[PDB]
Protein: Palmitoleoyl-protein carboxylesterase NOTUM
Amino acid sequence: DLRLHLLLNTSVTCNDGSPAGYYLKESRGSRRWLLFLEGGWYCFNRENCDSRYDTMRRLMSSRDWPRTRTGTGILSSQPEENPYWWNANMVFIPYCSSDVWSGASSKSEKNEYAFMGALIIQEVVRELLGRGLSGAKVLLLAGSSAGGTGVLLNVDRVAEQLEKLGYPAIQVRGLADSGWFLDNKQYRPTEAIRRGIRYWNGVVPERCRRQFQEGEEWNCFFGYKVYPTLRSPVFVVQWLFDEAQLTVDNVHPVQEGLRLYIQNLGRELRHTLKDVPASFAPACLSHEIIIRSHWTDVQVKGTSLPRALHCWDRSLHPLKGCPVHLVDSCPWPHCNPSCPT
Ligand SMILES: CCc1noc(C)c1C(=O)Nc1cc(C)on1
Ligand SMILES: *[C@@H]1O[C@H](CO)[C@@H](O)[C@H](O)[C@H]1NC(C)=O
Structure:
């Protein structure tokens, strides 16, 4: 179990002004730290956020959070469930800012809601340094779905923060799960992100911002455009036929037009990963993420994700029998036999 700590700086808040926080389980015999960003879509205007506050309030407020949570998948401390990092210090950061972890705007007389995702990450890091993070050798910033996009938006800022605070020896890396999307044509989204950024006062990584310039920062929410600008090592996990991608594309006995659409989506996703040396991209239709208990089951070319992550660690000290670039080439969902059911 990971136990809840509300932030000591009570000015860093969830959407409704309640304090943000983190769940922590320490492992005093380890210098590895895993900080995981929860996902859960986003909201982009007053009316849309009001609806989310009625029926998804835990994603907007800490008032009802439980005092503990169970670590599962990559957050599990049991070797049988987590062959990769079972002995690490474990941190789960709840998503209560509804801004894809991009915001830096407080509640005020002109703002009904606070959007502080980028500042929540920074304050969690600062408060952890006094609880043992100051002695870390590796800080892995991981996340799923909106949290996976959040990794891409925040990993280099964490590295810069630690350098400026005087901790040059901590190696910052990122693990982005299910957060690598395509701004493609629908079968039958980018505007919502564009409007969201203005509503949240959202921030993007600086090199990407300088490429796309004023008004075009929404481009930096798309993995294939932001990834080449990043300096920290980042491992990308993405299903070739991701269910959230297909939902926004309006895809739900398949005839020719839809067959060609789905095959082209998989080919485009595979193309965007060709120059990503650390990646795991199975040919499956899924919404499943790396904090699920059976995350060890899927394999690409005979290699599981926990193994690929271990090979990535070794590469950062190609390796015989220890691959890090694993992208399926077969062209239809479940052509990989190990896909989840
Ligand atoms: C990037 C923000 C985000 N956070 O969680 C989800 C889900 C999204 C999202 O928008 N996914 C998209 C977007 C397009 C186009 O296709 N899929
Ligand atoms: C709390 O966080 C806010 C926002 O990052 C910052 O302006 C303020 O200085 C912080 N308070 C303290 C005591 O550090």
Summary: The longest strand covers residues 138-144. Residues 146-165 form the longest helix (20 residues). Residues 278 and 324 are 5 Å apart (CA to CA). DSSP finds nine helices and 14 strands in the chain.
